[PDB]
Amino acid sequence: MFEVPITLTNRKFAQRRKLKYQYINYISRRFDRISKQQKKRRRERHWRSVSFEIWRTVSSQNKQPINKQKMTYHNFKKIEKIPLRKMEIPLLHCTKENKLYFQSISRGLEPLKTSTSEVRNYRTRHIVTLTDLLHLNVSRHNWSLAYKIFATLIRIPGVQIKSLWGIGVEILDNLSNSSSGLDFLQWMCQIYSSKSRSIVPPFQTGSRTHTAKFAITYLWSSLINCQKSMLIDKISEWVLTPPFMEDAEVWFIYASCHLLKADINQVIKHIHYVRTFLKICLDKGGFAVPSRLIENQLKSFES
DNA sequence: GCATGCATGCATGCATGCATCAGTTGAAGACAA
């Protein structure tokens, strides 16, 4: 009853997405008309926008104005009537289950089986139980079992590493026996930071644009390994090998490295330093409500 | 006929290939019959 961490499937689901986005396109085409293939799905899904430290959202103010009824019954069924037929052609080539699937999604029903629910089979149902027991044991603070789970999981030739916070917290409350925590974190980062589609990202990703998980997690957690102090110039040397260098938040990680080094003219240059990266992190992002707090601290330093 | 496998295609940089101090030297304007 939880998301699976393996690449969803082969099967039907492609032909279903076919039917879906093909029909979508026929209706939206005739709709702009009246208002006046993996690739068809691709263009289709394509032309569309793809007191505390909140990445504040973009709120409503310069946005738009009001609309007034577009769509009576007699006029919707206009736009519906033709594309449904063109659909009657390749519907003739997809399978019965997907005839009825398209039929119902087109009546506006919504399925009550899931892609997981219907992908039957010895092996996957076993993985499903394995991963469940993982997520359960981790909820239970049963770090030992949990760990056993995780290990037998990743042993299996199907699981992609989308279960890393799995370890990153698991191996984290497991001081016991294994290289851990930062080990995993900076490992993830080093491996998946270069070149060396669906079924993806925010908490996994590749290069050229940003990479939540591994990056920021080791990138603060090492600074927490320096709250273990009271290391830094290392974290800021290899933090100081950008660029993605639009990673503004990592600009704030850098400025944090300088406020922690600051804790004689050396300490000056470290406070000068943090003063610089805070605004080069006015790049944009959006942190630290008043930087005048950071700066009141920097004046407690200036003493 | 339908499902598994894996090879073809497509697309962003990169790498191979192929074309694009000192001497004699003359020339120019002033000057005499």
Does the CB of A196 sit below 7 A from strand B? no
Does the CB of A144 sit below 7 A from strand B? no
DSSP string, chain A: ----SS---SSTHHHHHHHHHHHHHHHHHHHHHHH--HHHHHHHHHSS-----------SSS----------HHHHHHHHHTHHHHTTTGGGTS-HHHHHHHHHHHTT---SS-HHHH---HHHHHHHHHHHHHHHHHHTT-HHHHHHHHHHHHHSTT--S--HHHHHHHTTS--SSS--THHHHHHHHHHTSS----S--TTS--SSS--HHHHHHHHHHHHHHHHTT--HHHHHHHHSS--S---HHHHHHHHHHHHHHH--HHHHHHHHHHHHHHHHTTTSS--SS-HHHHHHHHHHHH-
State this model's resolution in angstroms: 3.4
Give CA angle at A57 (A296, A284), nearest 5°.
50
Burial class (CB in 10 A: 0-12, 13-18, 19+), A219: buried
Contacts for A88-91: CB closer than 8 Å, 24+ residues apart: A90/A18, A90/A19, A90/A22, A91/A19
Q: CB–CB of A274/A259 below 8 Å?
A: yes
Distance from C-alpha of A18 to C-alpha of A39, rounded to nearest angstrom = 10
Does the CB of A12 sit below 7 A from strand B? yes
- Distance of A155 CA from B7 C1′ (whole Å): 28
Distance from C-alpha of A93 to C-alpha of A292, rounded to nearest angstrom = 66
CA A198, chain centre distance (Å): 12
Distance from C-alpha of A150 to C-alpha of A133, rounded to nearest angstrom = 9
Does the CB of A10 sit below 7 A from strand B? yes
**Elucidation technique:** cryo-EM
The C-alpha R_g of chain A, in whole angstroms, comes to: 26
Burial class (CB in 10 A: 0-12, 13-18, 19+), A181: buried
CB atoms within 10 A of CB A168: 20
Q: Which amino acid is it at A252?
A: F
Distance from C-alpha of A101 to C-alpha of A120, rounded to nearest angstrom = 18
Q: What residues contact A194, with CB distance under 8 A and at least 6 apart?
A: A206, A207
Q: CB–CB of A41/A24 below 8 Å?
A: no
Contacts for A108-113: CB closer than 8 Å, 24+ residues apart: none
Q: Give the closest nucleotide to A96 (alpha carbon vs C1').
A: B2
Nucleotides of B under 7 A from a protein CB: 2-4
Distance from C-alpha of A71 to C-alpha of A69, rounded to nearest angstrom = 6
- Distance of A114 CA from B10 C1′ (whole Å): 31
Does the CB of A272 sit below 7 A from strand B? no
CB atoms within 10 A of CB A22: 20
Does the CB of A93 sit below 7 A from strand B? no
- Distance of A187 CA from B5 C1′ (whole Å): 32
Does the CB of A30 sit below 7 A from strand B? no
Does the CB of A17 sit below 7 A from strand B? no
Does the CB of A42 sit below 7 A from strand B? no
